[PDB]
Amino acid sequence: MTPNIYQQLGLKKVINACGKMTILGVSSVAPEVMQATARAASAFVEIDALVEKTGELVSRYTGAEDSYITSCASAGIAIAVAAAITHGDRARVALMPDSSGMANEVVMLRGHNVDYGAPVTSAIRLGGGRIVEVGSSNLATRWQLESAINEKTAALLYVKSHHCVQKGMLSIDDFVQVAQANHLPLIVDAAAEEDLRGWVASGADMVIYSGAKAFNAPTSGFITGRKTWIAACKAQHQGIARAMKIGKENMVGLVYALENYHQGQTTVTAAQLQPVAEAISAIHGLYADIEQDEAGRAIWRIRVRVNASELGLNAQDVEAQLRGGEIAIYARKYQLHQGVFSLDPRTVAEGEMALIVARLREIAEHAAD
Amino acid sequence: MTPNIYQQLGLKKVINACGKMTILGVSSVAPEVMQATARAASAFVEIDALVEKTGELVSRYTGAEDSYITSCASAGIAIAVAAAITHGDRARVALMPDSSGMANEVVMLRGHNVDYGAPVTSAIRLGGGRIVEVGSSNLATRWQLESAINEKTAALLYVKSHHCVQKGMLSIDDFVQVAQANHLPLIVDAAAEEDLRGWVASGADMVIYSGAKAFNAPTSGFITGRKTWIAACKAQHQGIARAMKIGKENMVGLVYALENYHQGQTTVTAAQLQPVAEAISAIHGLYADIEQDEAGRAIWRIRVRVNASELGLNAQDVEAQLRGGEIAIYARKYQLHQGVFSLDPRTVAEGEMALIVARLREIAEHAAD
Amino acid sequence: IRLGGGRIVEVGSSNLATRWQLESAINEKTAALLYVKSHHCVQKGMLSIDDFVQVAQANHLPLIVDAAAEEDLRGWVASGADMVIYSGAKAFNAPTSGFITGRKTWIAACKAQHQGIARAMKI
Ligand SMILES: [Ca+2]
């Protein structure tokens, strides 16, 4: 392959087969999307008019009243909290994140206090919020959520993620009901979610997505929800949002990435994966098969099982040599203890499949057995 | 002209003749720079290796030990303060911006407390800093700077800007001497500055630039300085810097924009401006002449003076109709009270000069006199 | 200001000050608004004397104007300021002196200071 730009700077060529991981650059933007960004970058625009129009265009995909584009989902969380605390008041916006003497408590489940590389507490604290944790890490009841609300509460936060505790937690419906009964905004963190309308439709006031993670967009994120609260988010441009800046180029890039996602994307069919699966199985000690997501639909992956006796290496040794090689090959390390590594083709580009098989055989030949 | 992407979204075509203004998108990235960004966006990379290499490449232009790329200059200020307060300690990084019980005072001149669309206080406060203002708005002595230092002081901040009070303030040398005498880091805000080496060479520990403003780069900024303090800046990726994210694409874009700036750029010569100046003077009531910067070198601009009696409109009426027209034309509004507006050709692209002259005549014809 | 018992509340930045910033600084602890006319002050980007008069009269608070070097005796009183301060030596080549001029109700409160802090500022 012709060397990528990172190879030209002295870095390794990376093959992504794990997923949208922040340690590898999150996502690969489509070339059609980068064209729209470059044309936007090479021209001036009235930013105030761009903010409204991009919010209007993004809202067409989410079904909310208005939308606001941010630099990332973490910035969306900080802005959404600041919106709930300041109500858009220009004086309070300049004070953030020193919310002294204001209603600044953000109520969330303890099971949702998650670390995605950085603690979700940091994003909330940047917006001026003070975290109030509800329930235990394994169980949370509704009366615990209702008792946590008092005159200092500024917002409720619901976090949707596989990082969160999956059982024993309250439903999104419980948060909506408690929030509207106390006349408080409900904020939803759906950073990796691809469902654009489901979280807004549930009655949440502000929902936060990450444009890079889910929709393979240039570095971006957006808040979508009620126009009154989105307006309070926009007011943060004179405050904390000035440090979380996204330019006109990536604002446009997100919009075209949403349209590129809405038009549809041709996912890799199972028929295409089988030739790659057969080649890996030919290697001594490696057995490869195509597997749909055991708990998910419309996702095909190549599961590879390693026999230490035949190959001479365990699955941990294979995965490490895949990354450590001259071409950094990142596979899924979930079931590595069980002797299995898997390949997610969604982040794999054309031809990259063949290179992974070549490295697998080279690792086998270097066993020398 | 073929409609730009913003025109396709329903927005006005903008002609920039004022300068790098945040209300118009700051800057126009060079097409060669956008190519490097698109290739970077369409590929994965080990971010940890990219952070070091980009810091090394940026440091070649500034002469500092190391460098760190940020989303904007405001993010660089927040990170630099957090670096001075946390010293890179992972526990303190997670606490920001709640720097309770730490040395968190940032000492700066009151004459440097400026508003660039957002108060510089907001960026400092996001990093955990508490502002300590030195001197008055018109005068600041050295003993005032030395008396402000105590065991709670975390850093000294020097702000370079035309927004700052120009006379009566302390020199950069005074800040360096006081900072090193108390063993405290000196932070310099040089967001719009094009001098990459002068501020680092003066002995400042961390200097902050804006990649978009000065070097016509995609949305970016960087901190450059001593490796020990830059290391404390990098440590903020697990804390407040997670919300001020810049992706791999604009990280590369800044590096290629610095090389595109270092190779040199062909500035518009005075000979090229004269045809445009002559056409404007042909209009009744308008007198146009080329003028070098009265206080600056190597900057040519087209100063246009309006005669209300002849034209029928004052300079304020002309400037407003330039912006309000179907093509938004932004001129310099500094001496508009004196009956003069000027045209800065640095942000004007090829052919855009001719369109401005056409609108000027249309405004004159619509006088109907 | 501190000799008179005041605690300073600063509005805006050194280069820019908006009206909503001026109005937000007013609260139940506010005792007066102060406008300073001088070449020492920042010229561009600051609020006009009219903005201070309107905000002061909207909160029933006294507006104080420092016009020490000003030779305009009537212009600052005419704008509606409650107390305007001049320096007799600076502008009118007088022996060491100064004066406060303004509304009779507030000048009376100034005269009342002769039993207090004004005993140390004797003319
Ligand atoms: Ca509201």
Ligand SMILES: [Ca+2]
């Ligand atoms: Ca749902």
Ligand SMILES: [Ca+2]
């Ligand atoms: Ca072993």
Ligand SMILES: [Ca+2]
């Ligand atoms: Ca080789």
Ligand SMILES: [Ca+2]
């Ligand atoms: Ca250190």
Ligand SMILES: [Ca+2]
């Ligand atoms: Ca210098």
Ligand SMILES: [Ca+2]
């Ligand atoms: Ca008129």
Ligand SMILES: [Ca+2]
């Ligand atoms: Ca027409």
Ligand SMILES: [Ca+2]
């Ligand atoms: Ca007057």
